[PDB]
Structure formats: structure tokens, C-alpha cells
Design a protein around this ligand. Sequence first.
Ligand SMILES: COc1ccccc1Nc1ncc2cc(-c3ccc(-c4cccc(C)n4)cc3Cl)c(=O)n(C[C@H]3OC[C@H](N)CO3)c2n1
Length: 264
Amino acid sequence: TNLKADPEELFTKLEKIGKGSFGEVFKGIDNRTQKVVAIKIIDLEEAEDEIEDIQQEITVLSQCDSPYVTKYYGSYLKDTKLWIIMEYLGGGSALDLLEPGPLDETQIATILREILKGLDYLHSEKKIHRDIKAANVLLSEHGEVKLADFGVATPFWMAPEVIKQYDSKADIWSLGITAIELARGEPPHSELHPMKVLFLIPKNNPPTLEGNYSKPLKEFVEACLNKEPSFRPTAKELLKHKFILRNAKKTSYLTELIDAHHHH
Ligand SMILES: COc1ccccc1Nc1ncc2cc(-c3ccc(-c4cccc(C)n4)cc3Cl)c(=O)n(C[C@H]3OC[C@H](N)CO3)c2n1
């Protein structure tokens, strides 16, 4: 963390984007390069009890160097405010892109494949994302798909063993929930109170994808959503799943989805 430079001289802060954890996030401009960045500003007086969690997330992001993980550019302390500078992804989140109407299975498979590429990277690095969900999957203006908002080391995407207190297979369960979310718009149990969901996830059989979806997509979901973690496939294995191979296409086609969101 840079304690000498003035981030208000280095960056121009523009409009708020998304909905950041611990602090609001703004579109910003690097005044030296004129590149757009994302800027989170956290008041460290008001967010005192969470400082260790903030530090832990900075450390993890700073150790990641992947096309599939949002890049970390640095942080600055100005008076009581911590500025965190990240890669700007102008397409918004996958969750935002559900708003105009349902995805088709090519779009679902393409987004899942790119998420899987990020999980393959993290798991190979002995890391766990811990909060895979559509709101934490960001798209660039070119359709590139990247992971954001790592979980700290709401229940709807949590694996049963996480709730009951795990390894990288918890991310695979969360991916299965995210696949349902990309197909249906919301995760299982979304109509229920979160305290009820907390006991339902360990108690119940795993969710299935209900509706008129291809059998490969339903089987992709079922494979991720096994109560036994060792029965879930790895991210590497799921990149070869027939649903992915038969349906995923070039990520650049996702710009059509981004444009549809701008037109809605
Ligand atoms: C037009 O663009 C958008 C429109 C709509 C939505 C998103 C964007 N585009 C975007 N592009 C980059 C981001 C980088 C961070 C970001 C992430 C983590 C940290 C960070 C690092 C270390 C420690 C801590 C505590 N935090 C800092 C930042 Cl800067 C960020 O928060 N968002 C907004 C956020 O996206 C995910 C969603 N769940 C809630 O909103 C980001 N949005």
C-alpha cells in the first residue's frame, strides 16, 4: 500500500459503478495513461472491524496473474480513506446481463467455460475463490469474462460442507448453483428466508435444473451439485464436459449480450 502518493492527484474519480463491498466503487481515470480503472474507496474509520478481511483480499488479488481474474493495480491511503485500484470491466456483471431476458445455452456455456478457466487457474495456484455467483463474474466491453469479489476465508451459493464447516470442490458446487442462476435468473431457494436456506442446503437432496433445458446442461448442473465433494469433478475435467464442448463459442459473441443490456 502506497502511503506517500496522493491518489486524488493520480486518478480522476467518476460515476459510481456496481455495488462494492466495504466501500463504494467508481469508474475512474488514470491521469497519467488516461486508461479507465475501477476505484474502491473504503473509510477505514467506519470499516474498522473488517480491515483484516480487506488486507487478506488485497494479498490474494496481488498474487493472481491471469486473464480470468480481475487485475489489481495497487492501493493508496489518503487521510482515513483507502483507495483500491482495479481493472475496469465495462460490461458489468453476468447477473446484470440477465436483466433483459433469458440467456441461451450458447451464452450460458460460454460464460461457464470462462468461469471454469478462472477456477482452473486459482485451483492450480492452491487458491479457492469462495464466492462464485453471477454477481461476481464481470465482463469487459469486449466480452472477456473474469472473476471478482473473492469470498472471505447470504447462503444461496454455499456448498453444504461450507455451511456445516472444505477445499476447491466448494467452488465447484457454487459453480453448479451459478449455472442454475444463469439458466433461470436466480439460485435455488431464492424465495425463502436465508435462515431457512441455511438448514435446507445440508438437509435436502441437491438442487436440480428444472425446466426445458438440454440434458447436457442438466447433467453439468447435477455433476457439480453432488453432496459428496469428492464426487464433484475438477474444473479441468468440466472444461471437457459435453455441455461446454457442444455449446460454448467465442467470448467476443458476448458483446451482443452487453449491447442488449445497454438497449434495455
Ligand atoms: C460499467 O462497469 C460496471 C457496471 C456494473 C457492474 C460492474 C462494473 N464494472 C466493474 N469493473 C471492475 C470492478 C472492480 C471492483 C473491485 C473488486 C474488488 C476490490 C477489492 C480489492 C481488495 C480488497 C477489497 C475489499 N476489494 C476492489 C474493486 Cl475496485 C468492483 O467492486 N466492481 C464493482 C462490483 O462488481 C462486482 C459486484 N459483485 C459488485 O460491484 C467493479 N465493477
